């Protein structure tokens, strides 16, 4: 690979730490990511190939690198910090999100008797709305750069130490012509439950397909990390989607938010809100509840 001086970062300024998940992602310390503070430490996440990697895996990581170079920076996405391409393995260095993904963030903070605050869990309605608003802003940014995520879900939204939402894994080759719809992950996720019907049935992806997935994500937020289509296996999901099935309104979810969910799941993609409209609708709610 050729040297791109805009992005190249010396690999000896990285100290790799414990893995985060699986290419594979490992936490690391970086020294001098800001060239004005060359000895300053920061914590970053490093994407790299697995040991068993094929040349297709390498081309996929290179392609994700190139996408991330072109996407530019935004507060509500995981941003590219640097790359290591010379004289060693390929590393793509990105922001680290210290609280992990939004699904695990919410599930760990579900509401609960000593003291005056015993009924009070960590999550409040305005902060849930803010999480949704920040994801919509991130997606509005990605859309403006012509990026379709294709698997927007709470597990692909990461949370920083300051509760900033950052969309992750938006630049990936997703193998859309060879999806195993019955695939269950090691944590029990069925990713087909986030796919818009035009994507699932017709292999068509647009920004409006991401809007459908955003509606599923909204339902995940207001169930505090619930799994969508409760109890419905994939075979039944296909039949229910052909019949126009939609999820019920979650408990303790105001009708403004369930209304937004149902708009995101309108059958016609043109009848779903845009991300610009979702940003505006969620900002109105967020401002009203301060
Ligand atoms: C660095 O800020 C950091 N990060 C995490 N967690 C984390 O997930 N960071 C992360 C992951 C990531 O992509 C991976 C593949 C991923 C994962 Cl692991 C899970 N779901 C989706 C995805 Cl897409 C990217 C990218 N791109 C960026 N950042 C972290 O953790 C700690 C353990 N924990 C926390 C959340 O609940 C469950 C697990 C820790 C850190 C840095 N810190 C902070 C605290 N100190 C004490 C230790 C530490 O290493």
Using CA atoms, how far apart are residues 55 and 43, in angstroms rounded to an integer? 29
Contact 216, 194 (CB under 8 A): yes
Tokens of 127: 């902060």
* 25 is annotated as contributing to ligand binding: yes
User: How many CB atoms within 10 Å of residue 38?
Assistant: 10
User: Does the annotation mark 283 as catalytic?
Assistant: no
Structure tokens at 176: 């859309």
Among residues 39, 114, 151, 210, which one is catalytic? 151
**DSSP character at residue 178:** S
Candidates 31, 55, 51; CA nearest to 43 is 31
98 lines ligand 1 (CB under 6 A): yes
Distance between CA atoms of residues 289 and 126, nearest Å:
6
Query: Is 256 labelled as part of a ligand binding site?
Result: no
Experimental technique for the deposited model? X-ray
Atom of ligand 1 nearest to the CA of 108: 36
Question: Which residue numbers in the chain precede an interruption (C–N > 2.5 Å)?
Answer: 22, 112
Resolution of this structure in Å: 1.5
CB atoms near residue 44 (< 10 Å) = 20
- Calculate the alpha carbon distances from 275 to 137, 158, 182, 222, 281 in Å: 8, 19, 29, 19, 10
Residue nearest to atom 4 of ligand 1 (CA): 98
Q: Which domains does the chain have, with CATH numbers?
A: 11-94 (3.30.200.20), 100-289 (1.10.510.10)
Q: Are 169 and 61 in contact (CB under 8 A)?
A: no
Task: Residue 14: name the closest of 38, 36, 46 by CA.
Answer: 46
Q: How far apart are CA 211 and CA 207, in angstroms?
A: 6
For residue 286, how many C-alpha atoms fall within 13 Å in the half-sphere facing its CB? 15
């Amino acid at each position: 690979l050729p040297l791109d001086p805009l992005w190249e970062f010396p690999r000896d300024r990285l100290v790799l730490g414990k893995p985060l998940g699986e290419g594979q992602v490992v936490r690391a310390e970086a020294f001098g990511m800001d060239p004005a503070r060359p000895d300053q430490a920061s914590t970053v996440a490093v994407k790299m190939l697995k040991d068993n990697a094929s040349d297709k895996d390498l081309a996929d990581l290179v392609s994700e690198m190139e996408v991330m170079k072109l996407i530019g920076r935004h507060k509500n996405i995981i941003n590219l910090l640097g790359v290591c391409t010379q004289e060693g393995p390929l590393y793509v260095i990105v922001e680290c999100a210290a609280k992990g993904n939004l699904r695990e963030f919410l599930r760990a903070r579900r509401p609960p008797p000593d003291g005056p605050r015993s009924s009070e869990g960590p999550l409040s309605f305005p902060v849930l709305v803010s999480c949704a608003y920040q994801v919509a802003r991130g997606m509005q940014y990605l859309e403006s750069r012509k990026c379709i995520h294709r698997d927007l879900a709470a597990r692909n939204v990461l949370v920083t130490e300051d509760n900033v939402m950052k969309i992750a894994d938006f630049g990936l080759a997703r193998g859309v012509h060879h999806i195993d719809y019955y695939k269950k992950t090691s944590n029990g996720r069925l990713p087909v439950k986030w796919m818009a019907p035009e994507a699932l049935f017709d292999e068509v992806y647009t920004h409006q397909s991401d809007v459908w997935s955003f509606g599923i994500l909204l339902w995940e937020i207001f169930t505090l990390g619930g799994s969508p289509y409760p109890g419905i296996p994939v075979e039944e999901l296909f039949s229910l989607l052909r019949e126009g099935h939609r999820m019920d309104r979650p408990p303790h979810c105001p009708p403004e938010l369930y209304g937004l969910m149902r708009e995101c799941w309108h059958a016609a993609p043109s009848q779903r809100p845009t991300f610009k409209q979702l940003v505006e609708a969620l900002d109105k709610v967020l401002l009203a509840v301060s």
